[PDB]
């Protein structure tokens, strides 16, 4: 049919989506969560501070054991940090120094890297020779790599700077499934606890849920008014929080198909760089461009606490699987552990 | 106390020493950023010396690192901040673009966006006006006023080139902090690298004086 007819059909479907969304708006999260007691002031201290890096830190990820973490910086080095003792387990000399993302395999055997260069590098931590080396170079992407997350020891899903998100196979090193739903740049990813679905944030203020196996969009959320820099899954896997440059964080529910609550405040005019959840999901820790990190109560949507142990932008924010401690990287080249 | 963790601490200290050596090496090297519409001009600039393309060349016992971002074709707002520490930025625009399809206006828009960027507040810009030889003939054939209706002057290479230089320079709102080193180059032999080296040395002097507190 003609383009105008297709646009009319799209508008009618959009109106139907609006009607469906409003029909399910029984109540807001605030009035229902008013029945629970406020979390109260949350005080955290910097038990451990890491000064190994010499350049700006941009991404980090916690391991399954809740002991080892991997950090990435533009100096071109990946450092596996022993949180308890601060020892440097490994130091990977990156081929490309322009790295803005990293990931840790669930089993700890492999790590991921990516950034301005479109190639994705996977390193073997448990090689016989004892020296970490590159296993594969996934260069199928055309745009700059934005985020990477390990689904298993053989499958990895990464989001690039182009409009396409790809699922990769370590055994063959080819794009098994490619996602092209997003129209703008894709910033961050987040794997569900069941490792079956994942949400991707994009610069077009659109959050879309993808099926790892089926490989098509399942839901779309458009509650933000700017680019979505960060996204993370709820511990129970039925919700996720979105961080955006418009100085507001929104929690989306997969069943309700709409935002439940908005985290924003008048003094906070800066953007959000990273977002993470605690083990229980009660506390939402989100990074901010100002020299501090704010802890938000996911239910009551209030500033439980503020971490002002940084003097530069808080690029990344990682939380241990068991919730023992929270790691907050920043551009000051120092990584700190909070609990 | 520790029994075997002391070996891990020793390994960590050795890794830290290697990291310090690498950081010193990186600090000694000077980083340069390449920008400009059109692959031909940037290719000519590179020869006169898949994502990011890195070119390494040493001039007068100084190691120069140049980064290519044209091939990325992505929104600059999401990755331009990565180049905060670049000592200087090289902008390449062909003077002949004024008659092709509007390209000069796009180059001016890109220069205005880069020069007024918050991240590049304290980074100098080196402007290279490429294809002077082609501009010589284009002025003789096409007038400069096609893309600049406000322009009014003699149709000569000197006047038109000077007018282009002023037009590009006035876009710098931060005139107190930024310094634009405009230059003319078509196929200069051991002259372009001298100019870029001089500009980088001046930027290094400015940074050193700022560090010492005089600036």
């Amino acid at each position, epitope marked *: 049919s003609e383009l105008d007819q297709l646009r009319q059909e799209a508008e009618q479907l959009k109106n139907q989506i609006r009607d469906a969304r409003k029909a399910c708006a029984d109540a807001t999260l605030s009035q229902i969560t008013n029945n629970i007691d406020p979390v109260g002031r949350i005080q955290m201290r910097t038990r451990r501070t890491l000064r190994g890096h010499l350049a700006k830190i941009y991404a980090m990820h916690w391991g399954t054991d809740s*002991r*080892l973490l991997v950090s990435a910086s533009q100096d071109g080095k990946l450092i596996i940090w*022993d949180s308890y003792t601060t*020892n440097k*387990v*490994h130091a990977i000399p990156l081929r490309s120094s322009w790295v803005m993302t990293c990931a840790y395999a669930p089993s*700890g055997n492999y790590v991921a890297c990516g950034g301005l260069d479109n190639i994705c590098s996977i390193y073997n931590l*448990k090689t*016989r*020779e*004892g*020296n970490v080396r590159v296993s594969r170079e996934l260069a199928g992407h055309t745009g700059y790599l934005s985020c990477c997350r390990f689904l298993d020891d053989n499958q990895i899903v990464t989001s690039s700077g182009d409009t396409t998100c790809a699922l990769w196979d370590i055994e063959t090193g080819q794009q098994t499934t490619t996602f092209t739903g997003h129209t703008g740049d894709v910033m961050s990813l987040s794997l569900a606890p069941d490792t079956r679905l994942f949400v991707s944030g994009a610069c077009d203020a659109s959050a879309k849920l993808w099926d790892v196996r089926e490989g098509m969009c399942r839901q779309t959320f458009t509650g933000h008014e700017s680019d979505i820099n960060a996204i993370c899954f709820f511990p129970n896997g039925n919700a996720f929080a979105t961080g955006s440059d418009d100085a507001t964080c929104r929690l989306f529910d997969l069943r309700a198909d709409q935002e439940l609550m908005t985290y924003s405040h008048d003094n906070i005019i800066c953007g959000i760089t990273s977002v993470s959840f605690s083990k229980s999901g009660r506390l939402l820790l989100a990074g901010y461009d100002d020299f501090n990190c704010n802890v938000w109560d996911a239910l009551k949507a209030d500033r439980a606490g503020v971490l002002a142990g940084h003097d530069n932008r808080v690029s990344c924010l990682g939380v241990t699987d068991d919730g023992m401690a929270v790691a907050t990287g920043s551009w000051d080249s120092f990584l700190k552990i909070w609990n | *106390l520790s*029994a*075997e*963790d*002391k*070996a*891990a601490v*020793e*390994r960590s200290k*050795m890794i830290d020493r290697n990291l310090r050596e690498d950081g010193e090496k990186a600090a000694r090297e000077v980083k340069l950023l390449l920008l400009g519409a059109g692959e031909s001009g940037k290719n000519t600039i590179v020869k006169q010396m898949t994502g990011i393309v890195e070119t390494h060349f040493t001039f007068k016992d100084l190691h120069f690192k140049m980064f290519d971002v044209g091939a990325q074709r992505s929104e600059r707002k999401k990755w331009i901040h990565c180049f905060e520490g670049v000592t200087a930025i090289i902008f390449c625009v062909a003077l002949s673009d004024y008659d092709l399809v509007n390209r000069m206006h796009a180059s001016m828009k890109l220069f205005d966006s880069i020069c007024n960027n918050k991240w590049f507040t304290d980074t100098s810009i080196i402007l290279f006006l490429n294809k002077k030889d082609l501009f010589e003939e284009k002025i003789k054939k096409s007038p400069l006023t096609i893309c600049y209706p406000e322009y009014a002057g003699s149709n000569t290479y000197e006047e038109a080139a000077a007018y282009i230089q002023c037009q590009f320079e006035d876009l710098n709102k931060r005139k107190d902090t930024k310094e634009i080193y405009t230059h003319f180059t078509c196929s200069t032999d051991t002259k372009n690298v001298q100019f870029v080296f001089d500009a980088v040395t001046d930027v290094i002097i400015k940074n050193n004086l700022k560090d010492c507190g005089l600036f």
Partner: single-chain antibody
């Protein structure tokens, strides 16, 4: 990964020799070395240890000062120099690589070793309960040992390693830290302990398991070793 060693022979008492080993297939500089000696009838015994950075060099009490250990990372070769060796030194020496980090597997690889012949306290003691136990294919056997001091460090890691010396070849690491199996070791092996009493379980015994089983403690130097338990098929 190979470790070729040379420098054996027969020498009269009071002489001096320099054992040498060539390391290939792995990063020698990143791996710390150890030296272990086999008496003709007795068990393994540690000699010396040089770290990756050539620092924190340690020697056993019976060889302190008399022997020295040096390494050349650029040449990827290890030299052990022996001076004024006595009759008690007659043994077969093995070179062992080691790497120290969380999750590491030190003493995973052992060299073939060289034969050396001479013509005519304050350490943890490995009290092996038994010296020899008969076994049959398809059966299960438990090997237990006693330690003077509990190896359970305050960090929760007990420093207990197990080694198997099949006849005609060097020892092979099986379990390290009594809870992790070395690479290439069948999963049927299992170990457990309470920090002072240890037991090694070998389910579904296979003919390739014949040999002498040796213990190791790494809590405090010197790395004293047990008598060794031999299994006969």
């Amino acid at each position: 990964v190979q470790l070729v060693e040379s420098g054996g022979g027969l020498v009269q008492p009071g002489g001096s020799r320099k054992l040498s080993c060539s390391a290939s297939g792995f990063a020698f500089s990143s791996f710390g070395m150890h030296w272990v000696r086999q008496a003709p009838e007795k068990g393994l015994e540690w000699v010396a240890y040089i770290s990756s950075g050539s620092g924190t060099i340690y020697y056993a009490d019976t060889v302190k000062g008399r022997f020295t250990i040096s390494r050349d990372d650029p040449k990827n070769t290890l030299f052990l120099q022996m001076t004024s060796l006595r009759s008690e030194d007659t043994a077969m020496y093995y070179c062992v690589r080691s790497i120290y980090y969380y999750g590491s597997s030190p003493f995973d690889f052992w060299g073939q070793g060289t034969t050396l012949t001479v013509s005519a306290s304050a350490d943890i003691v490995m009290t092996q309960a038994t010296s020899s136990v008969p076994v049959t294919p398809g059966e299960s056997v438990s090997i237990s040992c006693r330690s003077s001091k509990s190896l359970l460090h305050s960090n929760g890691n007990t420093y207990l390693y197990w080694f198997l010396q099949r006849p005609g070849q060097s020892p092979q690491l099986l379990i390290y830290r009594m809870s992790n199996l070395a690479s290439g070791v069948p999963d049927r092996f299992s170990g457990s302990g309470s920090g002072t009493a240890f037991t090694l379980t070998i389910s579904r015994l296979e003919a390739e398991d014949v040999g002498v089983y040796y213990c190791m403690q790494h809590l405090e130097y010197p790395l004293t070793f047990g008598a060794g338990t031999k299994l006969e098929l």
